[PDB]
Ligand binder design. Sequence first.
Ligand SMILES: [Cl-]
Ligand SMILES: [Mg+2]
Ligand SMILES: [Mg+2]
Ligand SMILES: [Mg+2]
Ligand SMILES: [Mg+2]
Lengths: 373, 374, 374, 374
Amino acid sequence: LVKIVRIETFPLFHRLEKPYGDANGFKRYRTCYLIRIITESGIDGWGECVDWLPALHVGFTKRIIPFLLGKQAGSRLSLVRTIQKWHQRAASAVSMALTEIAAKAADCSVCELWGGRYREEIPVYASFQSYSDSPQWISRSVSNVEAQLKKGFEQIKVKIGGTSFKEDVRHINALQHTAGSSITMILDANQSYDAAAAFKWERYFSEWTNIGWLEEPLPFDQPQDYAMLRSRLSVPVAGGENMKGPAQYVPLLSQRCLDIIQPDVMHVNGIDEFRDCLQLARYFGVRASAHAYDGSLSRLYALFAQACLPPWSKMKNDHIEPIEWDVMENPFTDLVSLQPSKGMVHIPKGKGIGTEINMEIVNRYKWDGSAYE
Amino acid sequence: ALVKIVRIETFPLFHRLEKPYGDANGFKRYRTCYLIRIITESGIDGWGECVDWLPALHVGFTKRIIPFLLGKQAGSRLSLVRTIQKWHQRAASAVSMALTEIAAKAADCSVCELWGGRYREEIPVYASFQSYSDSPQWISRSVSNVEAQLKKGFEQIKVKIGGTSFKEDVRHINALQHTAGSSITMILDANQSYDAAAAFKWERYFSEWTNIGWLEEPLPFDQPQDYAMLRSRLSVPVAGGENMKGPAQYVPLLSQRCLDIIQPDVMHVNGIDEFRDCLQLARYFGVRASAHAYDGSLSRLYALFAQACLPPWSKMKNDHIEPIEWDVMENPFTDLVSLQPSKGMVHIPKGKGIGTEINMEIVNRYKWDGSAYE
Amino acid sequence: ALVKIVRIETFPLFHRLEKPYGDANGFKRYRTCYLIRIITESGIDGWGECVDWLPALHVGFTKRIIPFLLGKQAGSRLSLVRTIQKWHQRAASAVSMALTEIAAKAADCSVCELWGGRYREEIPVYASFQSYSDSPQWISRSVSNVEAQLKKGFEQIKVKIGGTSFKEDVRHINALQHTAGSSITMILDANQSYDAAAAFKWERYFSEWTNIGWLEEPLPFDQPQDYAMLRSRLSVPVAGGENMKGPAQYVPLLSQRCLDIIQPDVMHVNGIDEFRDCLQLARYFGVRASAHAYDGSLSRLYALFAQACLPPWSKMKNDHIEPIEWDVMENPFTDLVSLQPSKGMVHIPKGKGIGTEINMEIVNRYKWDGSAYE
Amino acid sequence: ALVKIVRIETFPLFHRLEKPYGDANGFKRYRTCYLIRIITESGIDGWGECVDWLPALHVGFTKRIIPFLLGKQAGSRLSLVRTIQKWHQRAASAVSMALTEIAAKAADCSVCELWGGRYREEIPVYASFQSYSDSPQWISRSVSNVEAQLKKGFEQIKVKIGGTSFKEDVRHINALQHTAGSSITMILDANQSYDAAAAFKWERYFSEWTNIGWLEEPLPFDQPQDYAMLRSRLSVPVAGGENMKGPAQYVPLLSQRCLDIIQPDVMHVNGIDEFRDCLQLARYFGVRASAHAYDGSLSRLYALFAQACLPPWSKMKNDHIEPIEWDVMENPFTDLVSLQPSKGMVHIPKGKGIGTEINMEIVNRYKWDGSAYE
Ligand SMILES: [Cl-]
Ligand SMILES: [Mg+2]
Ligand SMILES: [Mg+2]
Ligand SMILES: [Mg+2]
Ligand SMILES: [Mg+2]
C-alpha cells in the first residue's frame, strides 16, 4: 500500500521585476523547490524546501530520491530523522509529503490527523522588504504599505537596520503617519545591531503605542545580550528564524531571551519538529509566530499547525499569534490558492491538505538549470 | 471525520490484596483500575484507563465528564482533552486514550502509525517491587520475590528504600546485592522520604557498587535547587517526576538541571499527547525519560507505544532506549491487555488501533461493588 | 599588489575504503578531499582544501564561487573570505588558504613569517583512530592497530567510545590499557554519544587510570551548562568544539567554563585567519587549543603553521604546547603534502610559501568520477 | 628573511605647553613622544612610538631593550615582542610597530596589505578635547575651542567632565549642547571621576539629549560588576578600557557585560598584533571598539590601519565602523606624520610600509634636553 515508488522534483525560479531588500541587501530573484512523493497505491503528497537550487537539486537526485525509493511511507519519523542527518532542508520537504500521504490514507485532513483543530481562522501580518535601490525608497515603501492597508491588513512588518538610525526613523515616522495607531507595526532589524544601537529606538518605543515587536535586533551568539536588551525595551523582542529545532530554542527560553519565537517550517527538521517548536513555546509560557519569508505550501503547513495550537492568552479576541504573510512580488504565493481576507486566513478543511498544488505556476516558473550569479 | 460521541460506559474495578506490600508511604491493601469506553455514531469505539480514589473518580465521569462529552465530535481530541483537564486532570488521560483508539481505528492504522511510525518494536522493562511487607521476615520475602523474577530473565529491578532506618534499608539492599550480583541493574526508590543529607548517606555505598541504575525521588519537589545540589554530589543518576502533570511542570526542573531521568506517567499527565510531549521535551533537553507505571495495563500499553515512537537517547548501538517500569507485585489488572515481557523485553503489538483486546473476563470479575474500603 | 585572480582550478578526490572503520556515528566507507588552485595574473598561485559532500561542493565552486573570484584582487584576503563565508562556509576556508599561500610567495617569505614568525619549529601530534570496525573481533583489531602505531613512537593516541555499550567499550579500553601501559597518553572520544550521567560512568576508571589526556565531546553542544556541570565532576579534562564555525561560537562556551581544551578545525571555521583567532581566543581565556583534523592534509599543514606561531600555554619547559590530531587510518590523502611525524613530532617546513609541494600523483590518481555513492 | 637588527636609534621628544589644559586628573603642562628606529642588515628600516615618563623610558631602552635587540632576527616579531612585554610593557608596542614596518617593506606591500587587505580606506574620527583650563572663563573658552573644530567639519566630539561639581559640569555641557546642536555627536569623558550614583545623576539629561555617543570611563575598573549595574541603568552607551594591557584583560569585562565599546590604545597594549586582537575580540563578543589616542601620531596611524582592516560592526550601510580618537589640543607631534582629517574623516595612506614619512623637522626641533620637568 504505502511503499514509496516514485518521486518528482520541481526547482522553480523567478527573477524579480523590481529588486527589494532588507539589512542583508537587495534580493534579485525568488526560488522554490517542490517534491512529489508517490506510493504503490497511487496516494501522493507534496513538500516544499528552499536553498540554493544547483546544490539542492543534486542533493535530491543523487542522494535523497535514491534512499527513499522502496521505503515504507508510513515510517515518517524515522525517515525524516535519517535525512535530517545529511540535509535538514530536504528533511522538511520530505516530512510534509509524508504527512499529506498519511492524512489521505487515513481519509482525514492534516489537522484531524494531528488531533483536531482549535480554530478555522488564522491572523497574518503583511511582510515587506522595505528597501529598494532608489533615492525615493521611503516614498515607494509608503505606497506599498498603503496598498496593503487598503486590503484590510491590520498588522505589518517592515525593515530597519540597513541604513543609519536617522534615515530609518524618518521612514517609520512616514509609515506611522500614513498608517496611524490602529495598525500594528513590527520592526525587523535582521540582526544589524548591537544592544546600544537597538536601544536608540527606545525613545520612539516610549511614545508609540502600536509596535507589535522588535524582530532579531541582534545576532544570536550571545543569548545574555538578548535577555539584557529585552529587559531594557518597552516592546517585545522576537526571533529565532534560523533555529533548526526545539533543541536550539531551549537555552534561549531558559535564559528568558525572547518574548516571541519564530520558527520556520523550512528551517527546522520537519513539520513534526516545527509543531514541537510551537508547543515548546507554550510550555515555556512564551509566544510563537511562524516565520515564512519563503513558503507557500510550507506556509499552509504553518497555518495548519497554528490552527492546532492552543491559545496563548485568556483574551477572547487576542489569543493566537499571527503568521508571517510575504506581500512582496513573488509568483509562488499562488502555488496554492489561498490568500487572506482582511488579514485573516480561513484554513482548508478537506482531506489531505484540502487543496491542490497549482501546476500552471509550477510549469510557468520551471528553473532552466543555470545559476543566476 | 465529523462522527459524534453517543455513549460512554464506565468500569470501576477493585481488588483486595491477599498479602499487603508497601513502600515509604505505607502498606497497600488493594489495587484498582477505572476503564472507560467511548462509542461513536458509527459504532467505532475506544477505551481509556485512569486511576484515582474510585468514589470521586466515578462521580467526575458520570456527573460531569460524560454529560459534557455526549454529542461532541470524537475527532476534536486536542480541544476536548484540554477542557476536561481543567475539571479532572486524572480523567483527561483516559479520555485522550479512548479518542486515540477511535482515531486510529477510524484511519485503519495502528496507534504508532497514527503518530508517524515506530522506531523499534521491542522496549526493555525493569521489574518494579513494593519491597516492604508486614512481617519481621520482610527482607527474606523480598529476596525470594526478587529471585523469582530474576528467573524470568529480568535484568533490571526497582526496589524500595526510606521506609525504615538507613541501617535496616542497607541490610535489605545488601541482601539483594548478594543474591543478584553485579550483572543485575538495581534502582532504589526512596519515595520522597529524605532530605539531601539523608539521601547522601547512600553515597558511601554508591561509591563501591557498579550496578545502581538510579536513585529515584529521594526528595520532595518543593525546592528544585535541592535536587540540583544533591544530583551534583552523587555518583549515580537521579530520576523523578512521577507526579508532574505535564511538560510545563518539567520545564523548570530541566532548566535548573535537577534530574538525569524524568518519569512521566500516562495516567498522571494531561492526556497521551502531553505525555508524548514530556518524552520529547526530555530529548530536547538532553535528559532521559523512563515512563512510570505502578498502576496501569492499558495506559502502560500507550507508554510502550510512546516509547517505541521515541528516537534514541544515545549513539550506543546496544543501549539507546530507556526502560519502562513493569510492576510485578500481585495485581490481576496486569492482564487487562494480554501482553507481558519475555526476558525483560516487551514486543509491541502491530495491529490496527491498539493491536490487542481488553480482557472482558477480568473486567466483570473485578467489578467494583461501589463501597469504599474506608 | 593590485594583482588579479585570473584562473581557478578544482580537484575533487575520492577514495573508497578497502575495510570500513568507524566511530559512534557509524562506519566510514570512503574518504574524499577537495582541492583548489588559484592562479594570479603574475603566475603566482596558491592551493586550498576543503571538505563536504562532493556533488554539492563541486557545483558551489563551478557555479558561484569561481565566477565571483575571477578578476578580484588576490590581496583583499579578509574582504573576499568574508563575502564567501556568508554563502558557503566550507569553501571560504579553502579560499583563505589559497590566498595566504599567494600572499606569502608575493612577500618572498613563509606563511609563519607572514604571521610575525614562529615560536617553535616542532609540533607534537597524537595518533587518532577510528576504532570501530565491522567485526566480532574489532577490539583485537584496534589493539593490533594501536600496537603498530606505538612502534612508530607515538606517545599519545585517541580512540573511540560511545558506539556500543559501556561494558563493551570498557573491555576495549582495558585491552588498550594492557597493551600500551601507563606511559602512553590516551584520549577517549565519545563523539557526542552521551548525556552527563552516561559520561560520568567513566569517572570510576578515570580515578584509577593515570594516563587519560582528555574526554572528547561526551555530549551534544545544545546545552553549554551541561558541559560546565560535567566538567566539574570529572577527574580528567574535557575537550570539544570541532563543529564550531569560529571564535564567536566559542565565546559563550568559554565564558561559561564548558571546556578545558577547544578543538577548532581549519576546514570547519571561516578560513585560516579566524582559525588562528580561535587559537588566540583560547590563550586569552586561559584555556588550551588543540586543532581537530580527522580530514585534512594541506589544511592540516596550516594548523601546524598556526600552532608553531602560538604562544606557550604554560611555564613548563617541556610541556607548553598542545598536540594536533594526526589521523592514522587508511587515507591516501594523508600524502597530498609530503609530511609525517617522527616519534610523534612534526618538524615544520621553513621554506617560502608553504615550504613544500602538493603531490600531483595523488591528485591525478584519486580524481572523482562524478557519481555519488548511491 | 633571516635579516638581523644591526642598529637602533631613539628620539625622546618634549614640548612645554604655552597654555595648559586638562581633565579630571588635573592640568597638563607638556607633551612628550618617544620614537625609535630599528635598522636591519639589509638597510630596510622601521619606526615605532611609545609613551611614558622620558627619564625612565630612556634608560629602559638604552640599557636593556637595545642590547637585547641587536643581532636578533627582525622577522621574529611575535616572539621578540612577547619577551620585551615581560620587562617593559610600553617599549614592546614601539618595537612591534617598527618590526611591522620592516615586515611590510621587505614584503613590498603596505601594512594593511600585510595584515590581509583593507576593508575600506576612510576612517571617521572624533575631535577630542581637554576641556578644563586654568581660568574662571573656562566654559566660554571650551565653547570657542569646540566651535573652531565644528567649523572644520568634525561631526563628533569628546569633552571632559567630572573635574568640578555636577552643577558646573552640566552648565558647561549645556552650553556645548546649545552651540553644537543635535547633529553633533557628543561624548562625555569622566576619567574615572565618579561612583555609580554620581554617574547616574546625568541620566536625567541623557533622557532628553539625542546626540550622546557614549559616557566614557565614568568609574574606576576595580569592580567590573559596578560597570554592568551602571550600564543597565543608563540611556546611553558606556565605553572604557584605555589602560587595559591587552585582550586577556578585556575578556572578563566582556563576559560580564560591562561595556558597550572598548577603547584599547596602541601604546598601552602589548604591541600592534595584540591591539588588533583587542578589536577582533570586541567583534567576536558583539561589542564595539573605538581606539583611544590622547597621545600618538605614528601609533595613531597604526590604529587607523587596524580600523581599516576591521570588519563592519553593523549592517547599516552608512554607520558600520567606529570612529577613532583625534586629539585637537595644542601638540606639535600631531604632524610627526603628515595626516589630518578632512571633515572628520581620515583617508588611509596606501603606499608600501606605512605609506608616509616621519617629519624629521619636528623630530629635530623638539629633541629632549634630558632634563625633567618642573
Ligand atoms: Cl556540534
Ligand atoms: Mg525575521
Ligand atoms: Mg517513582
Ligand atoms: Mg572530536
Ligand atoms: Mg578615555
